[PDB]
Scaffold this active site. Structure first.
Site, short mmCIF file in Angstrom:
data_model
loop_
_atom_site.label_atom_id
_atom_site.label_comp_id
_atom_site.label_asym_id
_atom_site.label_seq_id
_atom_site.Cartn_x
_atom_site.Cartn_y
_atom_site.Cartn_z
N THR A 59 0.76 -1.27 0.00
CA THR A 59 0.00 0.00 0.00
C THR A 59 0.79 1.32 0.00
O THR A 59 1.78 1.43 0.68
CB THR A 59 -0.80 0.01 1.24
OG1 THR A 59 -1.62 -1.07 1.10
CG2 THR A 59 -1.70 1.21 1.37
N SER A 60 0.30 2.33 -0.72
CA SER A 60 0.71 3.74 -0.52
C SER A 60 -0.49 4.58 -0.06
O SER A 60 -1.49 4.67 -0.78
CB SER A 60 1.26 4.35 -1.81
OG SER A 60 2.19 3.50 -2.45
N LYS B 20 -9.33 1.93 -0.01
CA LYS B 20 -8.59 1.93 1.25
C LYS B 20 -8.93 3.13 2.12
O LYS B 20 -8.44 3.24 3.24
CB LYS B 20 -7.09 1.90 0.96
CG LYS B 20 -6.67 0.73 0.08
CD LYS B 20 -5.18 0.71 -0.18
CE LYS B 20 -4.81 -0.45 -1.08
NZ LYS B 20 -3.34 -0.59 -1.23
N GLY C 110 2.33 2.95 4.60
CA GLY C 110 2.31 1.84 3.66
C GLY C 110 3.68 1.62 3.04
O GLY C 110 4.56 2.48 3.13
N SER C 111 3.86 0.47 2.39
CA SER C 111 5.13 0.11 1.76
C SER C 111 5.65 1.17 0.80
O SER C 111 6.85 1.46 0.78
CB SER C 111 4.99 -1.22 1.02
OG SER C 111 3.83 -1.24 0.20
#
Ligand SMILES: [Mg+2]
Ligand SMILES: [Mg+2]
Ligand SMILES: [Mg+2]
Ligand SMILES: [Mg+2]
Lengths: 125, 195, 204, 233, 222, 196, 212, 222, 195, 196
Positions: free
Chosen positions: J1-2, J33, J128-129
């Site tokens: 996720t971003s 999200k 997020g990643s």
């Protein structure tokens, strides 16, 4: 749990529920124990307002607790079964832990102790 | 523990059970009776985890004796064996299972037949003409397959058992210090003193 | 499965006035089982003394090895090896086995024949030299020997006094170690006499 | 059983003649990521105690709430809550020490190292450490994490034993603390330049300094360092 | 994984005289290769002329001492201010330790005082509550360095009467408090030389029928 | 580590932080991660200090020997020698190296060599732990044919951010300018770059 | 540890060493590994010092309560079984105990029960228990006869512990001796191995493996 | 170990403590951690003691043979290169952590070598368990343009930080000074701030105390 | 394998060595001679890892026999024991070490003394009045400590050995199937057939 | 996720990609999200989809019950409820949540809640990643009191980059605008944001 103090003291110092339990015993069929020089005999009345009974199966009044000890009683029959069952369990538990059968005094003390406990416990007569 | 055998012949069940008790590199005892009388015509031999064995045997013994007193009656071998199996079947999914294997030899007085039941710690029951627990069976089952007959006498049974013990004493790695042999028949339970 | 504490044993060495002492217990066991009461851990090559604790097969092997090397030294050099030099040979030889070492705690003791100086040194299993004015300890009761020596020791003891000191350091260290004891030997070393004394100690 | 996520590095501290100093940077690291930069890790309790916390920040915030609630509770049915029955540093510490050891004993620690600095009502300086294991100790200087390795040696040069405390002024002591904070910024890869400092004095009370910066740094010599051995240009 | 135990080092030492007893311990508190404090005492007056030290993991040692002090308080409340005899203290402490048999206090515990005949008494405990009365005991990190010395100098082990052919042992005798303190100080300075966790300071608590006295000595700080 | 190399109009510039780390302890705050393997072929080192040094030392030897026999090596050649060592010993190395050099034919060139020992020729390259935090920034701000001053600014701003977020990175920002003019060493101290 | 107890013509001998170890560290040479439960009951201790010490003194409290309730001294069978049923409850938890419950009662005669922490309970005439048990067995077995005099029996017990104290690194310090008869138990002294070894060597001519 | 190196005006100085450990035990209280590689190149070593000695002696030997072969004074960068390539080859299994310093025809030099083969250049360096205590002092007090006497003070102060604060370090301070145009001066036990105090008692035994079974003269001659 | 003992008396060395060979739950053989004659006055008993034992024994035997032929001379027990030790000491740091323990009993004709050497697989050598390998020693060493005297006869030695075997047969968990006993004296090596 | 949330002049904007991943397989390319726990209190979810959903569902329940009794909850209150669940169940959750809401007193607010369950109030937050790759960018380009259009652009550019570098992130860019005016949902497809 049902908690009521059923066995309690009255002003004169009596516990009426215990005394009323004695009246139930006084109403029960007679039982007698006589001990000889080398034996003990247990005798028991069986009331004769009952014909057409089946004597084979009707619970006998003298119960073996262990192979060397017997218990007889006067009073409420249904009550007596509870005391006998507990006594029989304790007899086997004693053999298991002490590796020796109960003395008659011990077994009596245990049964007596059960009876006493029901005179100062909530919810029971 | 280790060696327990059982043979059912015409009119009796015979249990043979090793006498050694070993902890580590020491034989602590060479006269151990790995058996409990459950009722006058029912005998149970046992082997397995130290402590567990006797604790289980004595627990079953207490329970059957209680039953006898309550009913003034003796449970049949089949009934006892089924009670024992259920107790072990409960145990296997407990927090700590009894690790005990048993043979139950009894004489059923209502049918006048001897009966041998083999039950492992999982509660796996089988009725057999002859039985064993542990490595014992790996030698004796083949031998009894050969020499056993259903119509044998108690004396023929004892000789057949002497063959089994001889083989075990030849090929087993450990010294199990001989066996105590017991016979269960219509007159109850007695011990053979010279074996 | 810790090779340095399978067989058990101890060695301790001390300097005094114009003398040195080196002592060892006599035990050889296999873990809990005591096996030999006659396993000496001190050897000598000329006037240089070597004690070795640890795995007994390596103790034996290293004695045989240093006898080998000192004999050749003597034949080529035409003189006996001195302790400073022998100490260097011990270090070389152990470090040669850096990644497959002998499991030992050697101790060197002796008096230099030219200078008269007393000399002791200790080694780890991999050849590191621990030189010391006062004392060197080694073995399964090394903690105990350290504690005894560090309190009991004083400089410039005469041979007869040093004997008492080193013997008491060894004996009481040994009695607090299950794998050391079963006898003891002490070497008192002076310029040109060496006295070897077997001690009476508890045999448990 | 836990692993710390967002973390605070060293808390350093010392006693001086009239009181105690305590400091800690404003960083919440997330492993090697220098994630949060406005994090206050000194929490004052009343006007006589500062509690400095390192380790897990989620657990630090939990402890903030415990301390803030402790103040509330002490005020209840307490006419002397701002007087004789105000919270002492020794009370606040014993409470945290009790909690820390209970949590370790239940195998669920608060993943922190804590220093409680303050002045008792009788004027005595209080400085005591407690951590995730419930281990406690007192010393003229105290530091957590890297601080124990790099600050204590510097602060002990000023106060090496009990008798050095009356001889140490607040000017000297603060100098040492501020210097120690610079060293940790040179050498601890989980430190920040920005920090807070608090002085608790038996006369001047609590001074709480925010938004300090490490200054007077030596970097110039870097230009002369070329290669890693033989390289000349 | 979270490890609930640590090792704070230090070492302790109890010796019993005829009409006194000492309980000594260094004041250094460590974790790994760091010093936490050069003066953090770990020998305590617990009341009723009983001194106590629980050496090893300090958090466990402090909890134990705390609980025993509390046990003494309630002994008074429940038994008409009766004095807790040293033998009774020892047995109470056994139950404190064994109550955590399956999650132990990581400490070697030593207590000192006087028995009920006025004679000096030292009791030592393992982490789970095995205990024994002794003339002599060291505990903690340098116990292995100190104990054999005490066997030699307090109980005269391996020492024989000169000239007797090693047939007659050196005779046992009680020591003065002056002699015992000399042996303590030498024990700790020796231990300080050869054990890294031992140093900074030495604090001795002496116990006589007159109460509890203290003595403090510097130790090497490296 | 945070490192990068950027081609521009006149040549190429290499840049790096100065932090060497052993855990959270900074073993060296003034490290020089920009390393000469030839007059105008340099590299930025990231990964194990030992591995990257041993490698650069070997490469310098190879290129000195190349030079003696065949004259000046190309930047591609230098990058190939790095690759060969990194690829063939991939099991025993932790080395992420950026190679950068100036030919007069080829002008500025940048080759990056990640862990596997693959080779990637690029307009610019970023590497080291701190690089993760400036992929976004560098992609948005890089242009081809920048001037020297623009490139110095791009590198200074980029590594400033990498240093700001990466705790493993820090200290000073070193740069090395490779053009026809020669070789220029630049340094930028915290008090300047921190407040960009 | 090494501990033993054997039955014979004239009652029961019980002998134990006094060493306690923490690995190879000799922690004590003066441990009491026999516990006197009552004038007619003894318990030996091997394995975990604490486990044995704590649960065997606890056993004594249970025995004392039995004679208050039943007005009669507890049987050896029943005393041993209280202890074994207790440890069986803790089976798996890691208790470490090798004990022998020795005593005389009128109904039983002299009796020994081996009880360990796996829950094993065995009646028997001879047991040796501990890290040195095999050494003690070797001597005891080779010289044991039912008909031994009290004097010879005491010595054998003492000599067997000596044998183990010598060979087993984890046994030593001193020997503690007891005799149990119809009249109860009698202590027969603490015997330091320091002097006992040399005394026995000289007087018996044994231990030739040792430099005299 | 604590070890340091500090550059000054006209040369370089190195220092080290003198403690050697086996776990928590002090094996040697006065061991020499300053190693001569050549007359004017000295090396301070931390880590596995035998490894630092062997690797320093080996390279020292090869430097001598090199110096003879080339008819030149050896350089520090040669010792550095030979040490690092050797240690790198062994992937850290030779546990030597070295501060290399000296003077040669090229000038004065200071480097460090980790076990694994990585090298550093600096004006001040520290290695070993006590390196953080030492570095704290160096970072506090170092400046450019130090005199010889200032650098010695700084260096020995940095070792002292290690001696007092690090349990891995103690006893004494060794120093070696390598100035340009001069002989290197090795200052063994430059400081001795950990002298053992007078013991309380002499433990010299009455002669005859120790029981003896046998005597014999040992022959050491031919 | 498992049981090997040795006793040195006034004028001989006596080796006793168990006869069983067990693989798994089967005793494959009850008459195994765990010994090799190295020279006319030197005998080596052995126990340890299957295969390794005999391979090692026969290898040493071959080497000593070769020496004897080359020099027309018999190596002393001390010399043989030292050769054996060195061979094992090499082995222990090999790729695959010989896991063999040995007793060497020999009569030295030059000194007219019997000699017993105990050597384990690590190459740990000791000369002893009596010795054992494996669990054996845990019973026998204490017993020999008591009953052994240095001036005993060969017959006294054999009775002392009968005590050891009796104890092992009482307390050892495994059936080692008795022992083969061999005597080494000034007249060489002979086997006692009834034991 | 971003994911990210950004305060600005008129309120706050939340933004997120739309990729849900099981390994390298995209289980859902159009995920939402951005999740409503109250009219004008929303959150961005990252971590385990199950954990973050279960949490948001519980929080929505709590705030609905809060609302019935005490009226509209503050954004701080919403963030505290998230924290309580995340902190007390830290051993059994993988949830990195950003909470964002609009009061009329407090205007726009952003609280971020990382793995431990700590709370951090900030002007803007990223998580997020994909966030790792835009720390550099976002720190350089964020200003306080931006306009709606500037904030939408900041988020669009930022998440564009996070998506470009993070393979775990992708799909569409969803945004949610929280002001006094109401609640506005925005979406931006690849063909637009990819070529920024
Ligand atoms: Mg022993
Ligand atoms: Mg130190
Ligand atoms: Mg989950
Ligand atoms: Mg993508």
């Amino acid at each position: 749990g049902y908690d009521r103090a059923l066995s309690i003291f009255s002003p004169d110092g009596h516990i009426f529920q215990v005394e009323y339990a004695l009246e139930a015993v006084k109403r029960g069929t007679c039982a007698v124990g006589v001990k000889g020089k080398n034996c003990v005999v247990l005798g028991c009345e069986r009331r004769s307002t009952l014909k057409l009974q089946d004597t084979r199966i009707t619970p006998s009044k003298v119960s073996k607790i262990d192979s060397h000890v017997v218990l007889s009683f006067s009073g409420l029959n249904a009550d007596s079964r509870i005391l006998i069952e507990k006594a029989r369990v304790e007899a086997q538990s004693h053999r298991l832990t002490l590796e020796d059968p109960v003395t008659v005094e011990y077994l009596t003390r245990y049964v007596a102790g059960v009876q006493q406990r029901y005179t100062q416990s909530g919810g029971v007569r | 523990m280790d060696i327990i055998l059982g043979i059912r012949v015409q009119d009796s069940v015979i249990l043979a059970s090793s006498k050694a008790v070993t902890r580590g590199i020491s034989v602590l005892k060479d006269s151990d009776d790995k058996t409990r009388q459950l009722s006058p015509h029912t005998l149970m031999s046992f082997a397995g985890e130290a402590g567990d064995t006797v604790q289980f045997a004595e627990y079953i013994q207490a329970n059957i004796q209680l039953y006898s007193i309550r009913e003034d009656y003796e449970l049949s071998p089949q009934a006892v064996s089924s009670f024992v199996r259920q107790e072990l079947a409960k145990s296997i999914r407990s927090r700590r299972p009894y690790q005990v294997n048993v043979l139950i030899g009894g004489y059923d007085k209502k049918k006048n037949k001897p009966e041998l039941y083999q039950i492992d710690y999982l509660g796996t029951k089988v009725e057999l003409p002859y039985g064993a627990h542990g490595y014992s069976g790996f030698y004796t089952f083949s031998l009894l397959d050969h020499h056993y007959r259903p119509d044998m006498t108690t004396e023929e049974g004892l000789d057949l058992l002497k063959l089994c013990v001889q083989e075990l004493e030849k090929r087993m790695p450990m010294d199990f210090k001989g066996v105590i042999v017991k016979i269960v028949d219509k007159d109850g339970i007695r011990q053979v003193d010279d074996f | 499965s810790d090779p340095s504490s399978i067989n058990g044993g101890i060695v301790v060495a001390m300097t005094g006035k114009d003398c040195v002492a080196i002592a060892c217990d006599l035990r050889l066991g296999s873990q809990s089982l005591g096996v030999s009461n006659k396993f000496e851990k001190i050897f000598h090559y000329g006037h240089v003394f070597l004690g070795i604790t640890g795995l007994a097969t390596d103790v034996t092997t290293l004695n045989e090895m240093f006898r080998y090397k000192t004999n050749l030294y003597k034949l080529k050099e035409e003189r006996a090896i001195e302790p400073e030099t022998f100490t260097q040979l011990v270090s070389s030889s152990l470090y040669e086995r850096r990644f497959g070492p002998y499991f030992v705690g050697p101790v060197v003791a002796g008096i230099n024949s030219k200078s008269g100086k007393p000399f002791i040194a200790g080694f780890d299993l991999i050849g590191c030299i621990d030189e010391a004015k006062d004392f060197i300890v080694s073995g399964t009761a090394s903690d105990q020997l350290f504690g005894m020596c560090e309190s009991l020791y004083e400089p410039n003891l005469e041979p007869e006094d040093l004997f008492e000191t080193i013997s008491q350091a060894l004996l009481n260290a040994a009695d607090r170690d299950a794998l050391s004891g079963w006898g003891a030997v002490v070497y008192i070393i002076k310029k040109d006499e060496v006295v070897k004394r077997y001690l009476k100690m508890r045999q448990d | 059983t836990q692993q710390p996520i967002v973390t605070g590095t060293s808390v350093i501290s010392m006693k001086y003649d009239n009181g105690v100093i305590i400091a800690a940077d404003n960083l919440g690291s997330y492993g090697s990521l220098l994630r949060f930069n406005g994090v206050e890790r000194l929490i004052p309790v009343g006007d006589n105690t500062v509690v400095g916390i390192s380790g897990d920040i989620s657990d630090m915030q939990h402890i903030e709430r415990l301390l803030k609630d402790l103040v509330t509770e002490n005020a209840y049915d307490n006419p002397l809550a701002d007087a004789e029955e105000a919270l002492e540093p020794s009370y606040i510490f014993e409470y945290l020490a009790t909690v820390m050891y209970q949590r370790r004993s239940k195998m669920n620690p608060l993943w922190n190292a804590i220093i409680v600095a303050g002045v008792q009502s009788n004027g005595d300086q209080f400085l005591r450490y407690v951590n995730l294991l419930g281990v406690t100790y007192s010393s003229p200087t105290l530091a957590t994490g890297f601080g124990a390795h790099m600050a204590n040696p510097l602060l002990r040069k000023v106060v090496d034993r009990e008798s050095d405390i009356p001889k140490t002024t607040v000017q000297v002591a603060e100098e040492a603390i501020v210097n120690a904070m610079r060293v940790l910024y040179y050498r601890d890869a989980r430190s920040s330049r920005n920090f807070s400092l608090a002085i608790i004095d038996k006369n001047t009370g609590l001074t709480f300094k925010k938004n300090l910066q490490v200054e007077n740094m030596k970097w110039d010599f870097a230009k002369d360092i070329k290669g890693y051995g033989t390289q000349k240009i | 994984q979270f490890n609930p135990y640590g090792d704070n080092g230090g070492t302790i030492l109890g010796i019993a005289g005829e009409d006194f007893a000492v309980l000594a311990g260094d004041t250094r508190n460590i974790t790994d290769y760091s010093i936490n404090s050069r003066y953090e005492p770990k020998v305590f007056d617990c009341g009723d002329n009983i001194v106590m030290s629980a050496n090893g993991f300090a958090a466990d040692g402090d909890a134990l001492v705390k609980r025993f002090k509390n046990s003494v308080k309630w002994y008074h409340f429940d038994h008409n201010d009766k004095k807790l005899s040293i033998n009774s203290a020892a047995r109470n402490i056994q139950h404190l330790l064994y109550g955590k048999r399956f999650f132990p206090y990581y400490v070697h515990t030593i207590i000192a005082g006087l028995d009920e005949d006025g004679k000096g008494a030292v009791y030592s405990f393992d982490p789970v509550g095995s205990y024994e009365r002794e003339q002599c005991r060291a505990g903690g990190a340098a116990a292995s360095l100190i104990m054999p010395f005490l066997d030699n100098q307090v109980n005269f082990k391996n020492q024989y009467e000169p000239g007797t052919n090693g047939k007659v042992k050196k005779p046992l005798k009680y020591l003065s408090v002056e002699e015992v303190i000399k042996l303590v100080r030498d024990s700790f300075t020796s231990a300080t030389e050869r054990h890294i966790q031992v140093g900074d300071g030495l604090e001795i608590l002496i116990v006589t029928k007159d109460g509890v006295r203290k003595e403090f000595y510097e130790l090497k700080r490296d | 580590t945070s490192i990068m190399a950027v081609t521009f109009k006149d040549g190429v510039i290499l840049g790096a932080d100065s932090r060497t780390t052993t855990g959270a302890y900074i073993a060296n705050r003034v490290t020089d991660k920009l390393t000469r393997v030839h007059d105008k072929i340099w590299c930025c080192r990231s990964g194990s200090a030992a591995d990257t040094q041993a490698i650069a030392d070997i490469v310098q030897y190879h290129l000195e020997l190349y030079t003696s026999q065949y004259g000046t090596p190309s930047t591609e050649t230098a990058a190939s020698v790095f690759k060969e060592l990194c690829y063939e010993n991939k099991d025993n190395l932790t080395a992420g190296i950026i190679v950068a050099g100036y030919d007069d034919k080829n002008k500025g060139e940048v080759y990056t060599i990640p862990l596997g020992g693959s080779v990637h020729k690029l307009p610019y390259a970023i590497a080291g732990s701190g690089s993760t935090f400036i992929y976004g920034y560098c992609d948005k701000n890089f242009r081809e044919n920048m001037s020297k001053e623009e490139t110095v600014d791009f590198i200074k701003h980029s590594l400033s951010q990498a240093i700001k977020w990466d705790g493993s990175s820090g200290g000073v920002i070193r740069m090395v300018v490779l053009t026809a003019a020669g070789v220029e060493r630049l340094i930028f101290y915290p008090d300047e770059y921190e407040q960009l | 540890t090494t501990t033993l107890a054997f039955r014979f013509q004239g009652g029961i001998i019980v002998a134990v060493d006094s060493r306690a170890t923490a690995g190879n560290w000799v922690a004590s040479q003066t441990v009491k590994k026999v516990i006197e439960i009552n004038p007619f009951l003894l318990g030996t201790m091997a394995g975990g010092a604490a486990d044995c010490q704590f649960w065997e003194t606890w056993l004594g409290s249970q025995c004392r309560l039995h004679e208050l309730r039943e007005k009669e001294r507890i049987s050896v069978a029943a005393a041993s079984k209280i202890l074994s049923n207790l440890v069986y409850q803790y089976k798996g938890a890691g208790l470490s105990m090798g004990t022998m419950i020795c005593g005389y009662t009128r109904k039983e005669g002299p009796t020994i029960y081996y009880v360990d922490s796996d829950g094993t309970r065995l009646k028997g005439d001879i047991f040796c228990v501990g890290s040195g048990q095999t050494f003690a067995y070797g001597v005891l077995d080779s010289n044991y006869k039912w008909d031994l005099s009290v004097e010879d029996a005491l010595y054998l017990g003492k000599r067997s512990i000596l044998a183990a104290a010598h060979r087993d690194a984890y046994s030593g310090g001193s020997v503690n001796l007891y005799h149990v008869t119809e009249d109860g138990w009698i202590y027969h002294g603490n015997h330091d191995v320091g002097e006992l070894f040399w005394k026995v060597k000289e007087e018996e001519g044994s231990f030739n493996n040792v430099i005299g | 170990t604590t070890i340091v190196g500090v550059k000054f005006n006209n040369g370089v100085v190195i220092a080290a403590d003198t403690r050697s450990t086996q776990g928590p035990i002090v094996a040697d209280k006065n061991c020499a951690k300053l190693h001569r590689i050549s007359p004017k190149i000295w090396c301070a070593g931390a880590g596995t003691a035998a490894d630092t000695e062997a690797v320093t002696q080996l390279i020292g030997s090869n430097i001598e043979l090199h110096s003879l072969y080339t008819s030149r004074e050896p350089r520090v960068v040669s010792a550095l290169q030979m040490l690092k390539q050797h240690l790198f080859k062994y992937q850290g299994h030779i546990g030597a952590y070295l501060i290399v310093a000296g003077v040669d025809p090229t000038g004065s030099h200071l480097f460090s070598i980790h076990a694994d083969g990585s090298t550093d250049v600096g004006y001040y360096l520290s290695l070993g368990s006590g390196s953080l205590a030492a570095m704290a002092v160096l970072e506090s007090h170092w400046k450019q343009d130090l005199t010889k006497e200032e650098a010695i003070k700084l260096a020995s102060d940095a070792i002292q930080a290690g001696i007092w604060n690090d349990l891995g370090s103690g006893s004494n301070v060794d120093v070696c000074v390598m100035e340009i145009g001069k002989d290197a001066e090795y200052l063994r036990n430059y400081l001795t701030p950990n002298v053992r105090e007078e013991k309380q008692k002499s433990y010299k035994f009455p002669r005859g105390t120790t029981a003896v079974l046998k005597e014999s003269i040992v022959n050491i001659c031919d």
